């Protein structure tokens, strides 16, 4: 408070998290949604607004069309993005952006112009003194405590695995897959139609996402678990809807996350995450693979399915040579780990040299971010 502390903002497709530099915990975590009313409103003299933003939007789900501003990790509606950032700065943190620097995170492989846009609407409108952009998955490795290893980050919008050697990333070995939690929610909604239950609107998609977060797990063996569900009815759970109805999902608990390992269910050509990180390792040099097998770190919201670590280790050990040792690293707070890495990066004294000055931006236009940020 005596000195200006930077703002660490982690912004993915699913939720937005914001906090102060050097803090243990982010101050605000809220879904990245902008809702607009659809029904006729006749109640004059009481509270109506033309648009709802943040957790207030998810509170009044029954009278809105929920609309995600970030699609597959790419910003597609910039006005809603500015509204999200305004609600982040003023409603939640309640600090003006002009006093403090801000730090943003972004996907590894992306359209170029997005970064330019993230520059232009951050200096021109919010009048920040300085900012910086960092790759999301590097911060997971920084927060885990390791300078060398391969990290998979599978958020709600995009999945990507990057190998980092001696704290300094390799661009040619970066693998990006467009398969994340939202596609899993859509697949779960599609396969829940076969039992009779129907979910079609946006609030129903939020309810289905809640069902997925509550009752899903990854089977160690798909065939054995499927035969087990074919034998008895011990794999049945009952979830109570906000209407008051009770549904019994049963067999679908381990079929929804299995699309992560077998993307042929969705019809996509690309194969599962385990062989994806195997190919990412194989694209690197032979000498560094020994450190890469022993330092595999999982991160992101989708990687919080129960039993994901054992299945991942078994598959990647089946793919790996027999003489090599496999170690998976699953932090218990992996869902926030990227933000934690940001808090590490905003506290280093050398990082004061990294900041893009406002004068430098005014001199060089919005293209300063490619040469300044790596």
């Amino acid at each position: 408070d005596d000195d200006i502390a930077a703002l660490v903002v982690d912004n993915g497709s699913g939720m937005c998290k914001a906090g102060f530099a050097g803090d243990d915990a982010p101050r605000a975590v809220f879904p990245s949604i902008v809702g607009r009313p659809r029904h006729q409103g006749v109640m004059v003299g009481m509270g109506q607004k033309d648009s709802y933003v943040g957790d207030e939007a998810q509170s009044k789900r029954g009278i809105l069309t929920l609309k995600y501003p970030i699609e597959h990790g790419i910003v597609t509606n910039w006005d809603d993005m500015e509204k999200i950032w305004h609600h982040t700065f003023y409603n939640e943190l309640r600090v003006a952006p002009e006093e403090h620097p801000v730090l943003l995170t972004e996907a590894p492989l992306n359209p170029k112009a997005n970064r330019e846009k993230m520059t232009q609407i951050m200096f021109e409108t919010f009048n920040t003194p300085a900012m910086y952009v960092a790759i999301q998955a590097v911060l997971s490795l920084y927060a885990s405590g390791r300078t060398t290893g391969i990290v998979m980050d599978s958020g709600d919008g995009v999945t990507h695995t990057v190998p980092i050697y001696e704290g300094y990333a390799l661009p040619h070995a970066i693998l990006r897959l467009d398969l994340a939690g939202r596609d899993l929610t859509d697949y779960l909604m599609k396969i829940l139609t076969e039992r009779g239950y129907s979910f079609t609107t946006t609030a129903e998609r939020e309810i289905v996402r809640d069902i997925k977060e509550k009752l899903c797990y990854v089977a160690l063996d798909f065939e054995q678990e499927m035969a087990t569900a074919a034998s008895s009815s011990s794999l049945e759970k009952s979830y109570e809807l906000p209407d008051g109805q009770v549904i019994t999902i049963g067999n679908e608990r381990f079929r929804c996350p299995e699309a992560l390992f077998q993307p042929s269910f969705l019809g996509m050509e690309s194969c599962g995450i385990h062989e994806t990180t195997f190919n990412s390792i194989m694209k690197c040099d032979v000498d560094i693979r020994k450190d890469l097998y022993a330092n595999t770190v999982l991160s992101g919201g989708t990687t919080m399915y129960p039993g994901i670590a054992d299945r991942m280790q078994k598959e990647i050990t089946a793919l790996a040579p027999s003489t090599m040792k496999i170690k998976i690293i699953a932090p218990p707070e992996r869902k926030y780990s990227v933000w934690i890495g940001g808090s590490i990066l905003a506290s280093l004294s050398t990082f004061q040299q990294m900041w893009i000055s406002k004068q430098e931006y005014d001199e060089s236009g919005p293209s300063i971010v490619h040469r300044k940020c790596f």
Binding site: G167, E333, I344, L348
Partner: protein, 54 residues
Amino acid sequence: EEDPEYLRLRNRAADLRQDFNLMEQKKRVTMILQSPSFREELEGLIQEQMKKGN
């Protein structure tokens, strides 16, 4: 009540509180920061990205 702290406790769900307590107990940022060797090793590493970028 009208206090924003009471509404802050009123609004947020149980799992967010659970995560906040879980990653407040371990204090990962403090463990990375006040430990000298790792902290000043990243100090140096960021020094060579400055050297190496331009």
